[PDB]
Amino acid sequence: TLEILDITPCSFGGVSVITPGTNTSNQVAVLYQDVNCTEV
C-alpha cells in the first residue's frame, strides 16, 4: 500500500536497585531507568 510508518526502538534501560543497608532492613525498590511504566 502507500502508508507511512515510523520505526522507533524497543524500550531498554538499566535496572538499578535502591536499598537501605542490610543492617537496617531487607526490603528494596527497583528503578527502571528511561522506561514508561505502561510497559514495565
Binding site: 526502538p9 531498554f12 534501560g13 538499566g14 531507568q33 528511561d34
Partner: peptide
C-alpha cells in the same frame, strides 16, 4: 538560556541530579 542552542544503539543519557530550578 536562550543564547545557547543545541538513544538507539545502546547509548543513554541520564538526567542531572539537580534541576535548573534548584540551581
Amino acid at each position: 538560556f536562550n543564547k545557547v542552542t543545541l538513544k538507539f544503539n545502546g547509548l543513554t543519557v541520564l538526567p542531572p541530579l539537580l534541576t535548573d530550578e534548584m540551581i
